mmCIF file with all atom_site columns, C-alpha atoms in Angstrom:
data_model
loop_
_atom_site.group_PDB
_atom_site.id
_atom_site.type_symbol
_atom_site.label_atom_id
_atom_site.label_alt_id
_atom_site.label_comp_id
_atom_site.label_asym_id
_atom_site.label_entity_id
_atom_site.label_seq_id
_atom_site.pdbx_PDB_ins_code
_atom_site.Cartn_x
_atom_site.Cartn_y
_atom_site.Cartn_z
_atom_site.occupancy
_atom_site.B_iso_or_equiv
_atom_site.pdbx_formal_charge
_atom_site.auth_seq_id
_atom_site.auth_comp_id
_atom_site.auth_asym_id
_atom_site.auth_atom_id
_atom_site.pdbx_PDB_model_num
ATOM 1   C CA . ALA H 1 1  ? 161.037 -106.071 52.362  1.00 0.00 ? 1127 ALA H CA 1
ATOM 2   C CA . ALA H 1 2  ? 157.672 -106.557 52.998  1.00 0.00 ? 1128 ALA H CA 1
ATOM 3   C CA . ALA H 1 3  ? 157.371 -106.191 56.510  1.00 0.00 ? 1129 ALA H CA 1
ATOM 4   C CA . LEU H 1 4  ? 159.958 -103.032 56.061  1.00 0.00 ? 1130 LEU H CA 1
ATOM 5   C CA . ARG H 1 5  ? 157.090 -101.429 53.490  1.00 0.00 ? 1131 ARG H CA 1
ATOM 6   C CA . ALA H 1 6  ? 154.572 -102.740 55.860  1.00 0.00 ? 1132 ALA H CA 1
ATOM 7   C CA . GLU H 1 7  ? 156.277 -100.730 58.952  1.00 0.00 ? 1133 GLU H CA 1
ATOM 8   C CA . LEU H 1 8  ? 157.474 -97.758  56.573  1.00 0.00 ? 1134 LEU H CA 1
ATOM 9   C CA . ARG H 1 9  ? 153.701 -97.212  55.753  1.00 0.00 ? 1135 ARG H CA 1
ATOM 10  C CA . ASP H 1 10 ? 152.452 -97.514  59.192  1.00 0.00 ? 1136 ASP H CA 1
ATOM 11  C CA . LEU H 1 11 ? 155.142 -94.478  60.064  1.00 0.00 ? 1137 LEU H CA 1
ATOM 12  C CA . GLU H 1 12 ? 154.179 -92.714  57.090  1.00 0.00 ? 1138 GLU H CA 1
ATOM 13  C CA . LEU H 1 13 ? 150.600 -92.607  58.341  1.00 0.00 ? 1139 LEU H CA 1
ATOM 14  C CA . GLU H 1 14 ? 151.359 -91.436  61.916  1.00 0.00 ? 1140 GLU H CA 1
ATOM 15  C CA . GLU H 1 15 ? 153.611 -89.084  60.125  1.00 0.00 ? 1141 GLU H CA 1
ATOM 16  C CA . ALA H 1 16 ? 150.820 -87.372  58.169  1.00 0.00 ? 1142 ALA H CA 1
ATOM 17  C CA . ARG H 1 17 ? 148.381 -87.783  61.252  1.00 0.00 ? 1143 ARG H CA 1
ATOM 18  C CA . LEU H 1 18 ? 150.844 -85.905  63.558  1.00 0.00 ? 1144 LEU H CA 1
ATOM 19  C CA . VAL H 1 19 ? 151.430 -83.448  61.120  1.00 0.00 ? 1145 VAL H CA 1
ATOM 20  C CA . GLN H 1 20 ? 147.517 -82.823  60.731  1.00 0.00 ? 1146 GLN H CA 1
ATOM 21  C CA . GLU H 1 21 ? 147.439 -82.801  64.571  1.00 0.00 ? 1147 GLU H CA 1
ATOM 22  C CA . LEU H 1 22 ? 149.846 -79.989  64.304  1.00 0.00 ? 1148 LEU H CA 1
ATOM 23  C CA . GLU H 1 23 ? 147.952 -78.203  61.957  1.00 0.00 ? 1149 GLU H CA 1
ATOM 24  C CA . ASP H 1 24 ? 145.006 -78.078  63.743  1.00 0.00 ? 1150 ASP H CA 1
ATOM 25  C CA . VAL H 1 25 ? 146.906 -77.281  67.108  1.00 0.00 ? 1151 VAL H CA 1
ATOM 26  C CA . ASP H 1 26 ? 148.792 -74.738  65.481  1.00 0.00 ? 1152 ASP H CA 1
ATOM 27  C CA . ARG H 1 27 ? 145.649 -73.084  64.423  1.00 0.00 ? 1153 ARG H CA 1
ATOM 28  C CA . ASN H 1 28 ? 144.350 -73.207  67.767  1.00 0.00 ? 1154 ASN H CA 1
ATOM 29  C CA . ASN H 1 29 ? 147.286 -71.619  69.215  1.00 0.00 ? 1155 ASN H CA 1
ATOM 30  C CA . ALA H 1 30 ? 147.072 -68.914  66.590  1.00 0.00 ? 1156 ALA H CA 1
ATOM 31  C CA . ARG H 1 31 ? 143.610 -67.720  67.906  1.00 0.00 ? 1157 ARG H CA 1
ATOM 32  C CA . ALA H 1 32 ? 145.030 -68.213  71.160  1.00 0.00 ? 1158 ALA H CA 1
ATOM 33  C CA . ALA H 1 33 ? 147.849 -66.030  70.476  1.00 0.00 ? 1159 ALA H CA 1
ATOM 34  C CA . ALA H 1 34 ? 145.238 -63.481  68.921  1.00 0.00 ? 1160 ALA H CA 1
ATOM 35  C CA . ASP H 1 35 ? 143.021 -63.244  72.254  1.00 0.00 ? 1161 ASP H CA 1
ATOM 36  C CA . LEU H 1 36 ? 145.736 -62.674  74.562  1.00 0.00 ? 1162 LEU H CA 1
ATOM 37  C CA . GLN H 1 37 ? 147.029 -60.219  72.175  1.00 0.00 ? 1163 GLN H CA 1
ATOM 38  C CA . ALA H 1 38 ? 144.194 -58.605  72.053  1.00 0.00 ? 1164 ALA H CA 1
ATOM 39  C CA . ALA H 1 39 ? 143.728 -58.582  75.783  1.00 0.00 ? 1165 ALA H CA 1
ATOM 40  C CA . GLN H 1 40 ? 147.024 -57.267  76.062  1.00 0.00 ? 1166 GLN H CA 1
ATOM 41  C CA . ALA H 1 41 ? 146.308 -54.180  73.760  1.00 0.00 ? 1167 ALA H CA 1
ATOM 42  C CA . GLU H 1 42 ? 143.309 -53.376  76.077  1.00 0.00 ? 1168 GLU H CA 1
ATOM 43  C CA . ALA H 1 43 ? 144.997 -53.367  79.281  1.00 0.00 ? 1169 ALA H CA 1
ATOM 44  C CA . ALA H 1 44 ? 147.895 -50.882  76.993  1.00 0.00 ? 1170 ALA H CA 1
ATOM 45  C CA . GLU H 1 45 ? 144.547 -48.648  76.045  1.00 0.00 ? 1171 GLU H CA 1
ATOM 46  C CA . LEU H 1 46 ? 143.565 -48.390  79.715  1.00 0.00 ? 1172 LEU H CA 1
ATOM 47  C CA . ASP H 1 47 ? 147.037 -47.640  80.888  1.00 0.00 ? 1173 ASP H CA 1
ATOM 48  C CA . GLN H 1 48 ? 147.246 -44.732  78.592  1.00 0.00 ? 1174 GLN H CA 1
ATOM 49  C CA . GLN H 1 49 ? 144.038 -43.506  80.627  1.00 0.00 ? 1175 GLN H CA 1
ATOM 50  C CA . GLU H 1 50 ? 145.380 -44.409  83.662  1.00 0.00 ? 1176 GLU H CA 1
ATOM 51  C CA . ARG H 1 51 ? 148.778 -42.171  83.276  1.00 0.00 ? 1177 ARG H CA 1
ATOM 52  C CA . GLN H 1 52 ? 146.385 -39.426  82.387  1.00 0.00 ? 1178 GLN H CA 1
ATOM 53  C CA . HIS H 1 53 ? 144.480 -39.040  85.485  1.00 0.00 ? 1179 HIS H CA 1
ATOM 54  C CA . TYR H 1 54 ? 147.807 -39.999  87.203  1.00 0.00 ? 1180 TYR H CA 1
ATOM 55  C CA . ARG H 1 55 ? 149.234 -36.466  85.654  1.00 0.00 ? 1181 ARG H CA 1
ATOM 56  C CA . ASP H 1 56 ? 146.024 -34.958  86.610  1.00 0.00 ? 1182 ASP H CA 1
ATOM 57  C CA . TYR H 1 57 ? 146.301 -36.061  90.162  1.00 0.00 ? 1183 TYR H CA 1
ATOM 58  C CA . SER H 1 58 ? 149.453 -34.818  90.056  1.00 0.00 ? 1184 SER H CA 1
ATOM 59  C CA . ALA H 1 59 ? 149.394 -31.761  88.942  1.00 0.00 ? 1185 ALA H CA 1
ATOM 60  C CA . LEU H 1 60 ? 146.459 -30.791  91.019  1.00 0.00 ? 1186 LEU H CA 1
ATOM 61  C CA . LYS H 1 61 ? 148.436 -32.319  94.182  1.00 0.00 ? 1187 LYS H CA 1
ATOM 62  C CA . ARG H 1 62 ? 151.301 -30.088  93.068  1.00 0.00 ? 1188 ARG H CA 1
ATOM 63  C CA . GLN H 1 63 ? 148.965 -26.890  92.894  1.00 0.00 ? 1189 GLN H CA 1
ATOM 64  C CA . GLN H 1 64 ? 147.672 -27.469  96.353  1.00 0.00 ? 1190 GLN H CA 1
ATOM 65  C CA . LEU H 1 65 ? 151.036 -27.457  97.467  1.00 0.00 ? 1191 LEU H CA 1
ATOM 66  C CA . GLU H 1 66 ? 151.845 -24.271  95.835  1.00 0.00 ? 1192 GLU H CA 1
ATOM 67  C CA . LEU H 1 67 ? 149.144 -22.483  96.915  1.00 0.00 ? 1193 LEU H CA 1
ATOM 68  C CA . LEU H 1 68 ? 149.085 -24.003  100.401 1.00 0.00 ? 1194 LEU H CA 1
ATOM 69  C CA . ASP H 1 69 ? 152.732 -22.437  100.572 1.00 0.00 ? 1195 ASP H CA 1
ATOM 70  C CA . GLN H 1 70 ? 151.327 -18.735  99.199  1.00 0.00 ? 1196 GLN H CA 1
ATOM 71  C CA . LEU H 1 71 ? 148.610 -19.232  101.963 1.00 0.00 ? 1197 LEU H CA 1
ATOM 72  C CA . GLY H 1 72 ? 151.794 -19.765  104.875 1.00 0.00 ? 1198 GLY H CA 1
ATOM 73  C CA . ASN H 1 73 ? 153.351 -16.902  103.350 1.00 0.00 ? 1199 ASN H CA 1
ATOM 74  C CA . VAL H 1 74 ? 150.298 -14.602  103.609 1.00 0.00 ? 1200 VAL H CA 1
ATOM 75  C CA . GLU H 1 75 ? 149.815 -15.973  107.110 1.00 0.00 ? 1201 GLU H CA 1
ATOM 76  C CA . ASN H 1 76 ? 152.968 -14.819  107.897 1.00 0.00 ? 1202 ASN H CA 1
ATOM 77  C CA . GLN H 1 77 ? 152.529 -11.522  106.466 1.00 0.00 ? 1203 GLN H CA 1
ATOM 78  C CA . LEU H 1 78 ? 149.182 -11.419  108.624 1.00 0.00 ? 1204 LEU H CA 1
ATOM 79  C CA . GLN H 1 79 ? 150.895 -12.181  111.994 1.00 0.00 ? 1205 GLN H CA 1
ATOM 80  C CA . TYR H 1 80 ? 153.482 -9.700   111.676 1.00 0.00 ? 1206 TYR H CA 1
ATOM 81  C CA . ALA H 1 81 ? 150.888 -6.928   110.781 1.00 0.00 ? 1207 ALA H CA 1
ATOM 82  C CA . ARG H 1 82 ? 148.867 -8.150   113.768 1.00 0.00 ? 1208 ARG H CA 1
ATOM 83  C CA . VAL H 1 83 ? 151.854 -7.940   116.343 1.00 0.00 ? 1209 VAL H CA 1
ATOM 84  C CA . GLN H 1 84 ? 152.302 -4.428   114.753 1.00 0.00 ? 1210 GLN H CA 1
ATOM 85  C CA . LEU H 1 85 ? 149.106 -2.987   115.219 1.00 0.00 ? 1211 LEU H CA 1
ATOM 86  C CA . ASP H 1 86 ? 148.656 -4.723   118.500 1.00 0.00 ? 1212 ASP H CA 1
ATOM 87  C CA . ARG H 1 87 ? 151.646 -2.720   120.545 1.00 0.00 ? 1213 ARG H CA 1
ATOM 88  C CA . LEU H 1 88 ? 149.863 0.342    119.367 1.00 0.00 ? 1214 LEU H CA 1
ATOM 89  C CA . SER G 2 1  ? 146.969 7.117    114.441 1.00 0.00 ? 1064 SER G CA 1
ATOM 90  C CA . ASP G 2 2  ? 147.949 6.811    110.523 1.00 0.00 ? 1065 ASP G CA 1
ATOM 91  C CA . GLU G 2 3  ? 150.220 4.062    111.173 1.00 0.00 ? 1066 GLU G CA 1
ATOM 92  C CA . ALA G 2 4  ? 147.479 2.163    112.805 1.00 0.00 ? 1067 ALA G CA 1
ATOM 93  C CA . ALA G 2 5  ? 145.604 2.817    109.722 1.00 0.00 ? 1068 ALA G CA 1
ATOM 94  C CA . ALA G 2 6  ? 147.706 1.747    107.317 1.00 0.00 ? 1069 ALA G CA 1
ATOM 95  C CA . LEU G 2 7  ? 148.233 -1.476   109.620 1.00 0.00 ? 1070 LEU G CA 1
ATOM 96  C CA . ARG G 2 8  ? 144.229 -2.233   109.415 1.00 0.00 ? 1071 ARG G CA 1
ATOM 97  C CA . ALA G 2 9  ? 144.410 -1.535   105.650 1.00 0.00 ? 1072 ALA G CA 1
ATOM 98  C CA . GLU G 2 10 ? 147.173 -3.689   104.923 1.00 0.00 ? 1073 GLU G CA 1
ATOM 99  C CA . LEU G 2 11 ? 145.593 -6.345   107.292 1.00 0.00 ? 1074 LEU G CA 1
ATOM 100 C CA . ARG G 2 12 ? 141.793 -6.209   105.507 1.00 0.00 ? 1075 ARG G CA 1
ATOM 101 C CA . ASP G 2 13 ? 144.365 -6.612   102.014 1.00 0.00 ? 1076 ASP G CA 1
ATOM 102 C CA . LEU G 2 14 ? 145.613 -10.257  103.603 1.00 0.00 ? 1077 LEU G CA 1
ATOM 103 C CA . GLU G 2 15 ? 142.752 -11.060  105.016 1.00 0.00 ? 1078 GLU G CA 1
ATOM 104 C CA . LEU G 2 16 ? 141.119 -10.934  101.148 1.00 0.00 ? 1079 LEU G CA 1
ATOM 105 C CA . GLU G 2 17 ? 144.216 -12.202  99.980  1.00 0.00 ? 1080 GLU G CA 1
ATOM 106 C CA . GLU G 2 18 ? 143.877 -15.548  102.212 1.00 0.00 ? 1081 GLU G CA 1
ATOM 107 C CA . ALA G 2 19 ? 140.284 -16.058  102.024 1.00 0.00 ? 1082 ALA G CA 1
ATOM 108 C CA . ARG G 2 20 ? 140.709 -15.920  98.097  1.00 0.00 ? 1083 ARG G CA 1
ATOM 109 C CA . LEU G 2 21 ? 143.646 -18.570  98.222  1.00 0.00 ? 1084 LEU G CA 1
ATOM 110 C CA . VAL G 2 22 ? 141.233 -20.695  100.896 1.00 0.00 ? 1085 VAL G CA 1
ATOM 111 C CA . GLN G 2 23 ? 138.345 -20.396  98.137  1.00 0.00 ? 1086 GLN G CA 1
ATOM 112 C CA . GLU G 2 24 ? 141.171 -21.679  95.377  1.00 0.00 ? 1087 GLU G CA 1
ATOM 113 C CA . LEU G 2 25 ? 142.442 -24.885  97.693  1.00 0.00 ? 1088 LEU G CA 1
ATOM 114 C CA . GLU G 2 26 ? 138.652 -26.052  97.709  1.00 0.00 ? 1089 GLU G CA 1
ATOM 115 C CA . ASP G 2 27 ? 138.007 -25.861  94.100  1.00 0.00 ? 1090 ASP G CA 1
ATOM 116 C CA . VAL G 2 28 ? 141.302 -27.574  93.243  1.00 0.00 ? 1091 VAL G CA 1
ATOM 117 C CA . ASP G 2 29 ? 140.754 -30.130  96.382  1.00 0.00 ? 1092 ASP G CA 1
ATOM 118 C CA . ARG G 2 30 ? 137.050 -31.122  94.920  1.00 0.00 ? 1093 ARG G CA 1
ATOM 119 C CA . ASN G 2 31 ? 139.053 -31.880  91.243  1.00 0.00 ? 1094 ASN G CA 1
ATOM 120 C CA . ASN G 2 32 ? 141.672 -33.581  93.260  1.00 0.00 ? 1095 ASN G CA 1
ATOM 121 C CA . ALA G 2 33 ? 139.428 -35.271  94.546  1.00 0.00 ? 1096 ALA G CA 1
ATOM 122 C CA . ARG G 2 34 ? 137.562 -36.467  91.705  1.00 0.00 ? 1097 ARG G CA 1
ATOM 123 C CA . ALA G 2 35 ? 141.033 -36.953  89.824  1.00 0.00 ? 1098 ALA G CA 1
ATOM 124 C CA . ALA G 2 36 ? 141.712 -39.473  93.006  1.00 0.00 ? 1099 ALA G CA 1
ATOM 125 C CA . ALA G 2 37 ? 138.503 -41.212  92.359  1.00 0.00 ? 1100 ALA G CA 1
ATOM 126 C CA . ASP G 2 38 ? 138.965 -41.790  88.018  1.00 0.00 ? 1101 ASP G CA 1
ATOM 127 C CA . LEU G 2 39 ? 142.811 -42.524  88.666  1.00 0.00 ? 1102 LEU G CA 1
ATOM 128 C CA . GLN G 2 40 ? 141.484 -45.246  91.531  1.00 0.00 ? 1103 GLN G CA 1
ATOM 129 C CA . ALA G 2 41 ? 138.800 -46.387  89.312  1.00 0.00 ? 1104 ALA G CA 1
ATOM 130 C CA . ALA G 2 42 ? 141.287 -46.941  86.335  1.00 0.00 ? 1105 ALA G CA 1
ATOM 131 C CA . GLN G 2 43 ? 143.649 -49.293  88.676  1.00 0.00 ? 1106 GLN G CA 1
ATOM 132 C CA . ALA G 2 44 ? 140.685 -51.302  89.555  1.00 0.00 ? 1107 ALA G CA 1
ATOM 133 C CA . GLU G 2 45 ? 139.902 -52.118  86.246  1.00 0.00 ? 1108 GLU G CA 1
ATOM 134 C CA . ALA G 2 46 ? 143.692 -52.402  85.294  1.00 0.00 ? 1109 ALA G CA 1
ATOM 135 C CA . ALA G 2 47 ? 143.978 -55.128  87.949  1.00 0.00 ? 1110 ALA G CA 1
ATOM 136 C CA . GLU G 2 48 ? 140.893 -56.967  86.428  1.00 0.00 ? 1111 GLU G CA 1
ATOM 137 C CA . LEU G 2 49 ? 142.671 -56.533  82.665  1.00 0.00 ? 1112 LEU G CA 1
ATOM 138 C CA . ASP G 2 50 ? 145.647 -58.390  84.676  1.00 0.00 ? 1113 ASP G CA 1
ATOM 139 C CA . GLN G 2 51 ? 144.020 -61.102  85.855  1.00 0.00 ? 1114 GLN G CA 1
ATOM 140 C CA . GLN G 2 52 ? 141.986 -61.508  82.114  1.00 0.00 ? 1115 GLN G CA 1
ATOM 141 C CA . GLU G 2 53 ? 145.374 -61.537  80.485  1.00 0.00 ? 1116 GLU G CA 1
ATOM 142 C CA . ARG G 2 54 ? 146.755 -64.242  82.959  1.00 0.00 ? 1117 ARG G CA 1
ATOM 143 C CA . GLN G 2 55 ? 143.716 -66.687  81.902  1.00 0.00 ? 1118 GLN G CA 1
ATOM 144 C CA . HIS G 2 56 ? 144.432 -65.819  78.313  1.00 0.00 ? 1119 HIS G CA 1
ATOM 145 C CA . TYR G 2 57 ? 148.273 -66.686  78.751  1.00 0.00 ? 1120 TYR G CA 1
ATOM 146 C CA . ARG G 2 58 ? 146.991 -69.852  80.579  1.00 0.00 ? 1121 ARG G CA 1
ATOM 147 C CA . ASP G 2 59 ? 144.992 -71.256  77.502  1.00 0.00 ? 1122 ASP G CA 1
ATOM 148 C CA . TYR G 2 60 ? 147.940 -70.524  75.425  1.00 0.00 ? 1123 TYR G CA 1
ATOM 149 C CA . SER G 2 61 ? 150.438 -71.969  77.482  1.00 0.00 ? 1124 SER G CA 1
ATOM 150 C CA . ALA G 2 62 ? 148.079 -75.091  77.708  1.00 0.00 ? 1125 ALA G CA 1
ATOM 151 C CA . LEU G 2 63 ? 148.119 -75.214  73.857  1.00 0.00 ? 1126 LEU G CA 1
ATOM 152 C CA . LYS G 2 64 ? 151.662 -74.905  73.523  1.00 0.00 ? 1127 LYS G CA 1
ATOM 153 C CA . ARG G 2 65 ? 152.009 -78.049  75.791  1.00 0.00 ? 1128 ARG G CA 1
ATOM 154 C CA . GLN G 2 66 ? 149.822 -79.919  73.720  1.00 0.00 ? 1129 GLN G CA 1
ATOM 155 C CA . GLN G 2 67 ? 151.812 -78.684  70.687  1.00 0.00 ? 1130 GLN G CA 1
ATOM 156 C CA . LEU G 2 68 ? 155.335 -80.030  72.368  1.00 0.00 ? 1131 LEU G CA 1
ATOM 157 C CA . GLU G 2 69 ? 153.689 -83.498  73.013  1.00 0.00 ? 1132 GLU G CA 1
ATOM 158 C CA . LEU G 2 70 ? 152.732 -83.595  69.142  1.00 0.00 ? 1133 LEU G CA 1
ATOM 159 C CA . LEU G 2 71 ? 156.362 -82.090  68.069  1.00 0.00 ? 1134 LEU G CA 1
ATOM 160 C CA . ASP G 2 72 ? 158.188 -84.717  70.470  1.00 0.00 ? 1135 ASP G CA 1
ATOM 161 C CA . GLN G 2 73 ? 155.865 -87.675  68.860  1.00 0.00 ? 1136 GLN G CA 1
ATOM 162 C CA . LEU G 2 74 ? 156.590 -86.574  65.335  1.00 0.00 ? 1137 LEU G CA 1
ATOM 163 C CA . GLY G 2 75 ? 160.771 -86.363  65.980  1.00 0.00 ? 1138 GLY G CA 1
ATOM 164 C CA . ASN G 2 76 ? 159.807 -89.871  66.772  1.00 0.00 ? 1139 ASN G CA 1
ATOM 165 C CA . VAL G 2 77 ? 158.421 -90.988  63.938  1.00 0.00 ? 1140 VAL G CA 1
ATOM 166 C CA . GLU G 2 78 ? 161.248 -89.215  62.128  1.00 0.00 ? 1141 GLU G CA 1
ATOM 167 C CA . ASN G 2 79 ? 163.912 -90.870  64.066  1.00 0.00 ? 1142 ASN G CA 1
ATOM 168 C CA . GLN G 2 80 ? 162.457 -94.350  62.747  1.00 0.00 ? 1143 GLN G CA 1
ATOM 169 C CA . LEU G 2 81 ? 161.785 -93.137  59.157  1.00 0.00 ? 1144 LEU G CA 1
ATOM 170 C CA . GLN G 2 82 ? 165.052 -92.889  58.875  1.00 0.00 ? 1145 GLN G CA 1
ATOM 171 C CA . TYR G 2 83 ? 166.299 -95.946  59.913  1.00 0.00 ? 1146 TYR G CA 1
ATOM 172 C CA . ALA G 2 84 ? 163.647 -98.007  58.058  1.00 0.00 ? 1147 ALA G CA 1
ATOM 173 C CA . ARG G 2 85 ? 164.245 -96.005  54.895  1.00 0.00 ? 1148 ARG G CA 1
ATOM 174 C CA . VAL G 2 86 ? 168.180 -96.881  55.475  1.00 0.00 ? 1149 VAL G CA 1
ATOM 175 C CA . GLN G 2 87 ? 167.346 -100.808 55.969  1.00 0.00 ? 1150 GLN G CA 1
ATOM 176 C CA . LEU G 2 88 ? 164.908 -100.748 52.611  1.00 0.00 ? 1151 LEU G CA 1
ATOM 177 C CA . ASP G 2 89 ? 167.264 -98.731  50.509  1.00 0.00 ? 1152 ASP G CA 1
ATOM 178 C CA . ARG G 2 90 ? 170.106 -101.339 51.211  1.00 0.00 ? 1153 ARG G CA 1
ATOM 179 C CA . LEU G 2 91 ? 167.366 -104.321 50.009  1.00 0.00 ? 1154 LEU G CA 1
#
């Protein structure tokens, strides 16, 4: 009886100690999670910016290709007209 | 001849049209080079932000492993409490 009470008190002390250490570690987990989520948010904000530069870069590349095509068509007309005039 | 004259005029119009296109291309290409620079700088920052994120994830997983060890301990204590309480209730 006495020994069982003694063991039980010892166990309940260890329970309360582990509970408390778990409260401290759960608080620490929380801060680390908040800091991870902050870093994730920063990466998402940067990503929005990155995508916008990518859309600019693509749009400008598309517009360069279109202008190059236009220039080639003009150049075909130019070479045709030069042939016509050289024959005269 | 009038035919040669018409061709020479057409060629002048096309030469101006090419010059105008060439210039448009140069202005587009200078903004394109800047967009590339901006994009590259954003990509380099994203690679940095990723490395940082992983370091925070490492801190968090360390702390989770410390939690898991305490939970194992606690479950061990609860197992012992059930036994010891059963024994005591019988006396």
